[PDB]
From Swiss-Prot, chain A:
Its EC number is 2.7.11.2. Induction: Down-regulated by insulin. Up-regulated by reactive oxygen species and cigarette smoke extract. Up-regulated by PPARD. Homodimer, and heterodimer with PDK1. Interacts with the pyruvate dehydrogenase complex subunit DLAT, and is part of the multimeric pyruvate dehydrogenase complex that contains multiple copies of pyruvate dehydrogenase (E1), dihydrolipoamide acetyltransferase (DLAT, E2) and lipoamide dehydrogenase (DLD, E3). The keyword Signal does not apply. Kinase that plays a key role in the regulation of glucose and fatty acid metabolism and homeostasis via phosphorylation of the pyruvate dehydrogenase subunits PDHA1 and PDHA2. This inhibits pyruvate dehydrogenase activity, and thereby regulates metabolite flux through the tricarboxylic acid cycle, down-regulates aerobic respiration and inhibits the formation of acetyl-coenzyme A from pyruvate. Inhibition of pyruvate dehydrogenase decreases glucose utilization and increases fat metabolism. Mediates cellular responses to insulin. Belongs to the PDK/BCKDK protein kinase family. This is [Pyruvate dehydrogenase (acetyl-transferring)] kinase isozyme 2, mitochondrial. SMART domains: HATPase_c. Expressed in many tissues, with the highest level in heart and skeletal muscle, intermediate levels in brain, kidney, pancreas and liver, and low levels in placenta and lung. The gene is PDK2. It catalyses: L-seryl-[pyruvate dehydrogenase E1 alpha subunit] + ATP = O-phospho-L-seryl-[pyruvate dehydrogenase E1 alpha subunit] + ADP + H(+). One of its GO terms (biological process) is regulation of calcium-mediated signaling.
Length: 354, 371
């Protein structure tokens, strides 16, 4: 309903990446609701249009699956919802209240995008018989689609959580979804506790947790950073589940399981979190498969965990020793000014892969 | 008569390089190298293979040397390395019409390979000196030059593969009355004790560290033989290659540990774990040397990157990684800034999985050198 014209226009622009510190500025006394509106009514169409161009480059057999068609229809509707605001007055508190409601509607509409897109890959696999693990097009696309999705969810969450007028705010000292004083070990313990509750139900034994902090500059100081705790939680929950599953499965006896050891290091540039297990490990040749969408989980926990780490210029790396165990390391930027969004952009480089 | 490969001359070298460059290098498995020792009737076979294969490998990489930017190619050190490769190619071409049935041909061939090995002994630092000549003349940081980085990885991996073929022939067939390591098949130890190679590399790095520093970290080794916990870990490998990797990693771990503990006489130890799985032999070296931020790891594997006691020559760590890759292994670094660094050597546990990784001169390679 005009959609191809809007997609074409907004696709020409590059997404504009923000630092964690710029997110904080948008949610502070340095900015207001009008600033967030004028930014987002341009930025959300650019990001929606850029990924919608890439969806339309998928092989026709993937594009025509019911679930991919459903996801494409949501993106089209969300783009048109934001177009209603392009000529509205930012000075008018009605415009701003209507915009917040439109973003809440979009967030609800897109809530199940991750499993719905995964269902479309399975529909493709179960119809045509091509293993999506081995299809490099689908793997390349899903990394960029899911990173795009994380970036759009971050923009919408920041606006709706800050400008809600949220009656009783969950975590009242957060700036939207950002904790400017995130205690990293508390997020580690919370992710471990949730993984331990699941592991106790299904195995009747879980490895213990051991945490060590190294604050290079200030030995005694409990480590804090500016981060989105839900993103950190998602990564650590996934890593704990895998380390606990490997530890339990590789041990004859559930009586004396080796613990999972976590080290949190704060350097000048990096906040590093290493999770070490004695779960028997993975041969080097098979590490790549663990980050493959829908490999032998719902098929996406570990690759999406790695996208959350990449999103603010971090990484998630696995280093295994077959016959012994596995180290997983989350690398985050220590400084909010270094934590800049990593966004896929629709360009010649992207086009080539498809 | 005046056939292309007859009465070879310096003047003819471009034509010979063109001819041999049309063939692909033929990769051998560690298992095939073991077979080619098992009888001295294998000497004729080694000769007939090597008088074709060494010209092919020489010619393939010589094509890429000639694609270097003019200002790198013209350096005296690069010209020197290219002149050695040309002479070595001509030396082997003298054998193309000679009779393998004549024991004189075989003894002359072994002498010619020993001459070549001696001539090429300093190729690694000479090539590096040419890149430095380029850097120090033009002020282009070779770390950031993707052409030079691409070339050096392929050049040094080619060099490793040539040295392996020459070592296998000369150490099996030279007929040393009482040989140094009598249980080896050329340079291959079919019962390589990995911990002993770790201890030898540690001892040599500690000798160097004790020269410059008042203290050096101790060594701790742990073994996990998954299938047989009581069995000391052994594998089929080339122990000199494993030594070169472990020497480089010990030097770096010792340098980091000392520099982060400036006036300490009691240092955190360097811990090594050797794990044997069904597919992988993994060696992890762990230090408490204060670590490297993630953004700077890529630089450590860049040719001619520097931050001379245990300082680098610009190639130790990337060439260590080429030794791991040469038989389908790898060398990976993972650091934790403010704590320390883990380096992991991954080797194939099975001699049949250990196949030479060789660069081949093709259109794909040619493209990389194009503006
Ligand atoms: C696409 S996904 O995100 O949905 N997906 C990825 C996660 C996967 O589950 C797992 C879990 C654990 C393990 C595992 C083993 C182990 O299990 N070895 C035995 C065979 C494992 C496969 C096997 C093969 O594939 O052939 C080859 C060795 N050992 O160490 C780990 C390990 C892994 C991670 Cl990632 C970790 O963080 C910590 C660990 O200790 C492997 C796989 C299901 C789902
Ligand atoms: C191209 S080469 O192969 O010739 N070669 C050059 C010379 C050598 O450099 C080295 C050695 C050690 C270290 C080092 C530090 C450290 O020293 N941090 C301090 C930073 C401060 C300036 C920083 C920068 O900005 O570059 C970068 C180091 N901490 O952990 C390690 C470490 C490294 C390796 Cl590889 C390892 O195996 C074990 C280790 O503990 C860094 C660099 C290798 C690479």
């Amino acid at each position: 309903a005009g959609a191809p014209k809007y997609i074409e226009h907004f696709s020409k622009f590059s997404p504009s990446p923000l630092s964690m510190k710029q997110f904080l500025d948008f949610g502070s006394s340095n900015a207001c609701e009008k600033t967030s509106f004028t930014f987002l009514r341009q930025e959300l169409p650019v990001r929606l249009a850029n990924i919608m161009k890439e969806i339309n480059l998928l092989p026709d057999r993937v594009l025509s699956t019911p679930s991919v068609q459903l996801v494409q229809s949501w993106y089209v509707q969300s783009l048109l919802d934001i177009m209603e605001f392009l000529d509205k007055d930012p000075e008018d508190h009605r415009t701003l209240s209507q915009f917040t409601d439109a973003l809440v509607t979009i967030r609800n509409r897109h809530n199940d995008v991750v499993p719905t897109m995964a269902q479309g890959v399975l529909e493709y696999k179960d119809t045509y018989g091509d293993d999506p693990v081995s299809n490099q097009n689908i793997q390349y696309f899903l990394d960029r689609f899911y990173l795009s999705r994380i970036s759009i969810r971050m923009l919408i969450n920041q606006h709706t959580l800050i400008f809600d007028g949220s009656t009783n705010p969950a975590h009242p000292k957060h700036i939207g979804s950002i904790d400017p004083n995130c205690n990293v070990s508390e997020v580690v313990k919370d992710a471990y506790d949730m993984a331990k509750l699941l592991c106790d139900k299904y195995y009747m034994a879980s490895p213990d947790l051991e945490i060590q902090e190294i604050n290079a500059a200030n030995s005694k100081q409990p480590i804090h950073m500016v981060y989105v705790p839900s993103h950190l939680y998602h990564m650590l929950f996934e890593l704990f589940k895998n380390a606990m599953r490997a530890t339990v499965e590789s041990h004859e006896s559930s009586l004396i399981l080796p613990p999972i050891k976590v080290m949190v290091a704060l350097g000048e540039e990096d906040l590093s979190i290493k999770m070490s297990d004695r779960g028997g490990g993975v041969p080097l040749r098979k590490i790549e498969r663990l980050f493959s969408y829908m490999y032998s989980g719902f098929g996406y926990g570990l690759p999406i965990s790695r996208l959350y780490a990449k999103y603010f210029q971090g990484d998630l790396q696995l280093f295994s020793m077959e016959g012994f165990g596995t180290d997983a390391v989350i690398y985050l930027k220590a400084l909010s000014t270094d934590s800049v969004e990593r966004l896929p952009v629709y360009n010649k480089s992207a086009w080539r892969h498809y």
